[PDB]
């Protein structure tokens, strides 16, 4: 009898001051807010029902109305920022944190869910949820000897909410909150549920998306080997955040990059650099570009793992945004690599796909490619072999393209393209 009420009828029941009439109107509101087709969230808000729902959260003597109002508020909070703000403005944050201690599992789970929606709105509400003290009772729900004893959906909701507490930048989450959460994240990262694993990886990817000090907090917990293992998962929803975290880590110091290499990550990149999902190839190639921007011994590990032919492959054929990352990987490679490493790069056939990408109507990748050509010529000068490279570039049509770039509009494109020809093709 609570199906398809009007908002007016819901208001009538909630204003009735009959607890059972209030409970049924609240359930009717929950069912209204649970429909896929355009749930009347704004009409419920404008009816002034949020403070009433929040008040119902505190009725410990009537657990069903706590549950129904928590569910109704969860779905309002899952909407726009203005709709989430209406829930927060109703005082729902401390009420939901109090419900985390509920003896009813389905009620505390709803409070977990609601706080995840609120924290997921942005850094402001995230930090406000933290200031209200949500982390201690949330982590206390996971303080069991074995996570497998917890209900699966319950554990998935807790992991997701914890990930939203790790989410967003400007500012990043408070340092002490991250330290408080991380040991539980590491444990969730070893759980055997695919959705817990995915959301745990997402949380780690958020925490590593920052300066080296943030990356270091994660790396010192020793999770890089587990991240590398999850890099090899068959589930794309796990590989994607695991790869984002690995890529974030290698934006840090050479020592942090080395932890990724030491853990065996490069052995997965033959598959990642040919992955059918465009986003995986792009992320994997971007990651490779930050590894080839490392030390010469790290460039050498890329060589030993047979990854240069795979970089030649993505440069030859990939989505353009992936080919752009491949161009960066080559320019970084030639900028920091030894003469012998650069020679090997030419031997793998980098020149022709490099030249072909000078056709691209992207002024930055042209600058990137021209830089790599200069770097390769500089290594050819140290060998006295610039003539042979000049022949290679012309034979594949590269010099025709470089000379067309002399009439290019953007400045450093045509300055650099004349310097190449003036010096090596003249």
């Amino acid at each position: 009898g609570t199906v398809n009420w009007s908002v007016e009828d819901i208001v009538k029941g909630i204003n009735s001051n009959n607890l059972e009439s209030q409970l049924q109107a609240t359930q009717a509101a929950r069912k209204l807010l649970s429909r896929e087709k355009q749930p009347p969230i704004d009409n419920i808000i404008r009816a002034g029902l949020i403070p009433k729902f929040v008040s119902f959260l505190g009725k410990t003597d009537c657990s069903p109305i706590q549950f129904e109002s928590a569910w109704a508020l969860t779905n309002i909070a899952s909407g726009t920022s203005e709709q989430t703000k209406a829930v927060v403005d109703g005082g729902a944050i401390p009420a939901f944190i109090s419900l985390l201690a509920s003896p009813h599992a389905h009620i505390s789970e709803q409070a977990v869910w609601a706080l995840g929606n609120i924290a997921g709105d942005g850094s402001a509400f995230r930090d406000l949820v933290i200031k209200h003290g949500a982390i201690d009772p949330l982590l206390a729900l996971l303080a069991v000897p074995d996570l497998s004893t917890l209900a699966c959906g319950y554990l998935r909701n807790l992991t997701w909410t914890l990930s939203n507490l790790c989410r967003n930048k400007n500012p990043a989450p408070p340092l002490d909150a991250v330290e408080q959460i991380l040991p539980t994240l590491v444990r969730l990262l070893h759980h055997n549920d695919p959705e817990v694993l995915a959301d745990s990886c997402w949380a780690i990817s958020y925490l590593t998306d920052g300066p080296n000090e943030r990356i270091e907090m994660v790396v010192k917990k020793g999770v890089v080997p587990q991240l590398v293992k999850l890099l090899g998962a068959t589930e794309l929803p796990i590989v994607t955040p695991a790869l984002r975290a690995i890529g974030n880590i290698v934006t840090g110091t050479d020592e942090q990059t080395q932890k990724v290499i030491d853990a065996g990550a490069l052995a997965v990149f033959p598959s990642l650099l040919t992955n059918p999902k465009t986003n995986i190839q792009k992320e994997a190639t971007w990651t490779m570009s930050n590894i080839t921007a490392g030390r010469q011994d790290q460039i050498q590990q890329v060589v030993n793992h047979g990854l240069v032919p795979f970089l030649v492959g993505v440069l030859s054929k990939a989505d353009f945004k992936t080919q752009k990352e491949a161009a960066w990987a080559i320019t970084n490679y030639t900028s920091g690599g030894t003469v012998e490493q650069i020679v090997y790069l030419v031997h793998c056939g980098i020149i022709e796909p490099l030249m072909n990408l000078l056709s691209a109507k992207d002024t930055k990748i042209i600058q990137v490619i021209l830089d790599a050509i200069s770097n390769i010529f500089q290594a050819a000068e140290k060998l006295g072999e610039t003539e042979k490279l000049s022949i290679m570039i012309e034979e594949c049509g590269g010099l025709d393209k470089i000379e067309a770039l002399q009439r290019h509009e953007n400045e450093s494109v045509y300055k650099a393209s004349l310097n190449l020809i003036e010096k090596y093709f003249s």
């Binding site: 899952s78 909407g79 989430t84 869910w113 997921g120 997701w160």
Partner: peptide
Amino acid sequence: EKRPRS
């Protein structure tokens, strides 16, 4: 990410 309960 926000999630409604359907």
